[PDB]
């Protein structure tokens, strides 16, 4: 309803670096804000693509960042008469990016590694891996928790159970309140998906150079499966975190799986050490629902919710037809021990191959009148293609059915404006919060400031 | 806390065959490697293995080929380590050992297990 | 196998001493080495890994340093407790193997 349109503040970053990939706010011990941004192809020593992070500091007037620095060096061990290799090449560091606390996790889910032994190695795969850095301190940290040293032969005499060695982990990314963070691997156990989490405090405390493998004992992973449901489902595409269970000592966690049981897509709500509490079935194949998911009290009663976004989802239109336009999907958490239940709402895509519902961020009370809103990106849409952010304002009885405010990119074609997210974080200090959207394939980011209402 | 609780002292004879218990306290057995190493006072320190007790695979010292034998039960968080045909040779001090961040490494130490082998 | 030739075989020292331990291998270990303590008739306490790196709840007087092939470890101002056999372990390896120990022992 009261971002501001005309007053823009842009940051950018190298060409082809993709620059805005991902996002967040962060902020300093001092509560000072500024934006950490993700560029997964920007260019390393060797002019080979490794990707990069960005930590622009907040002025109205934007521009240039400085990076925040991490070891691109691919990383070599001979220990136990073994050989342990990374390869940091086009390993996508940054695309994604998260803030807790006063630490940075920037992740690189296609970063590689490979184990030799004699004639045999366990194969060049990508475990992806994550980079934690405290910007005041320069401390610096990795979590990689799907690298292993066990040998190709030995999967394969064991049928490829408990395979991590495509997890990816990092693809996506989320930390509780607590400091606890949760990665996403979608390619973990031969690609069904499967979740990592560690205390960013035991990250820190049990890292040191050069090791390449460790140990982080306070870990947890999820598990491998043999339902073939979860075959192929990418368990881990998308992560949040929520209170869905009624005990706030508890921590939830939301997994999105966007080709869940033969591309059907589903979400699952867990609890901590990933016991399956319910699970949001797809409505239509191949619409890529999970794709993403966001979790905020839109309605104002203290409970949750949960919104579900699938881009390509193809609604029916005149003469038995057709149009990939995508869908988003409003479940409100019910009063006390209950299941979630049908949609209370849904929001669907008006332009052909707009992808409504790529992302989903929560913007806190926008318009400051209590309910908590909600901004989604269709980042082809618009009546040019060049990408929309839509608004809905929370009520009572859910979400509003009509976007409050709509933003036009402000980019050219191919930009994918709207492709990352991030809302309810007040930078400028005016008492309301802002938003910034990620435009990579302009290698730009843009800042909306909320302002008074009109 | 990570505690490593290994069986009492054995007395046995020789030509026979004993099994040692190495229990995990405060952690789970399955999360490292684990290690046995040999003591004796003229000989030292001697690595005789090491099992993953996730998977069961397990590495020796082409010399404790023949005698040593490691297995794990992760049931009782347990690692073992089978002697046969003792020898007063084999009479020494046996620990069951495991790293604390390396995957490679020797950090954690039980209290150790005494053997003697005599008729 | 990798040899490992750790001096001196013992020495004799006072409370407040800066010493030194070595440890020599036959061959470079790239840093993996582990250094450990055994109190007269108790059992082994980690001290360092990966050369340089101290286990959870080692003082900071303990300090591992060395490249290659040739590897130390240095006590700063000896307490009491230190007095104690010292060992060396390569896992650069396998079979891991260890040092002949050294033995602090107090001077008089």
């Known amino acids: 309803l009261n971002l501001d349109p005309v007053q823009l503040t842009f940051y950018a970053g190298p060409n082809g670096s993709q620059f805005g990939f991902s996002l967040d706010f962060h902020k300093d011990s001092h509560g000072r804000v500024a934006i950490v941004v993700g560029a997964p192809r920007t260019l390393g020593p060797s002019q080979e693509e490794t990707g990069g992070v960005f930590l622009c500091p907040w002025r109205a007037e934007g521009g240039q960042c400085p990076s925040l620095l991490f070891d691109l060096r691919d990383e070599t061990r001979n220990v136990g008469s073994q050989t342990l290799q990374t390869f940091k090449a086009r390993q996508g560091l940054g695309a994604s990016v998260v803030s807790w606390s006063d630490v940075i996790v920037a992740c690189a889910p296609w970063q590689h590694w490979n184990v030799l032994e004699k004639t045999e190695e366990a194969e060049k795969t990508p475990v992806g891996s994550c980079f934690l850095a405290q910007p005041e301190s320069g401390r610096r940290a990795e979590y990689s928790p799907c690298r292993g040293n066990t040998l190709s032969r030995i999967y394969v005499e064991n049928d490829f159970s408990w395979d991590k060695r495509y997890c990816e982990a990092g693809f996506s990314s989320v930390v509780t309140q607590a400091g606890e963070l949760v990665l996403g691997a979608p390619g973990g156990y031969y690609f069904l998906g499967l979740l990592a989490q560690a205390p960013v405090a035991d990250i820190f405390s049990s890292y040191r150079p050069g090791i390449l493998l460790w140990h982080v004992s306070s870990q947890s992973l999820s598990f491998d499966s043999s339902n073939p449901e979860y075959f192929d489902g990418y368990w881990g595409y998308s992560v949040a975190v929520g209170e869905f269970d009624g005990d706030l000592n508890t921590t939830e966690y939301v997994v999105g799986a966007p080709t869940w049981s033969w591309t059907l897509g589903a979400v699952e709500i867990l609890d901590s050490y990933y016991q399956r509490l319910h699970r949001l079935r797809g409505e239509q194949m191949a619409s890529y629902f999970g794709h993403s998911v966001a979790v905020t009290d839109v309605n104002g009663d203290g409970r949750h919710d949960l919104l579900v976004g699938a881009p390509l989802y193809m609604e029916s239109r005149a003469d038995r037809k057709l149009a990939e336009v995508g869908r988003v999907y409003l479940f409100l958490q019910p009063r006390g021990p209950h299941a979630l239940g049908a949609p209370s709402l849904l929001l669907t895509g008006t332009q052909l191959y707009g992808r409504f519902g790529s992302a989903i961020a929560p913007l806190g009370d926008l318009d400051r009148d209590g309910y908590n809103d909600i901004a989604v990106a269709a980042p082809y849409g618009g009546p040019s293609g060049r990408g929309q952010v839509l608004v809905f304002l929370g009520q009572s009885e859910g979400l509003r059915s009509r976007p409050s405010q709509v933003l036009d990119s402000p980019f050219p074609t191919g930009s994918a404006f709207g492709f990352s997210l991030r809302g309810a974080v007040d930078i400028d200090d005016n008492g309301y919060p802002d938003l910034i959207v990620g435009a990579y394939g302009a290698n730009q980011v843009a800042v909306y400031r909320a302002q008074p209402v009109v | 806390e990570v505690q490593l609780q290994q069986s009492g002292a054995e007395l046995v004879k020789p030509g026979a065959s004993v099994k040692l218990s190495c229990t995990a306290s405060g952690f789970n057995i399955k999360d490292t490697y684990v290690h046995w190493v040999k003591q004796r006072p003229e000989q030292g320190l001697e690595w005789i293995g090491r099992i993953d007790p996730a998977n069961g695979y397990t590495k020796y010292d082409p010399k404790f080929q023949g005698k040593a034998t490691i297995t794990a039960d992760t049931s009782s968080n347990t690692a073992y380590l089978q002697l046969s045909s003792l020898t007063s040779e084999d009479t020494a001090v046996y620990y069951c050992?495991?790293?604390?961040?390396?995957?490679?490494?020797?950090?954690?130490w039980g209290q150790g297990t005494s053997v003697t082998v005599s008729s | 196998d990798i040899l490992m030739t750790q001096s001196p075989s013992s020495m004799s020292v006072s409370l407040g001493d800066t010493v030194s331990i070595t440890c020599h291998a036959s061959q470079g270990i790239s840093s993996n080495i582990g250094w450990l303590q055994q109190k007269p008739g108790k059992s082994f306490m980690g001290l360092i890994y990966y050369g340089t790196n101290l286990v959870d709840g080692v003082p900071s007087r303990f300090s591992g340093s060395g490249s290659g092939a040739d590897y130390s470890l240095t006590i700063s101002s000896l307490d009491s407790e230190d007095f104690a056999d010292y060992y060396c372990?390569?896992?650069?390896?396998?079979?891991?193997?260890f040092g002949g120990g050294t033995k602090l022992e107090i001077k008089r």
């Open positions: 050992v495991r790293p604390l961040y390396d995957y490679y490494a020797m950090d954690y």
């Open positions: 372990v390569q896992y650069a390896q396998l079979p891991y193997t």
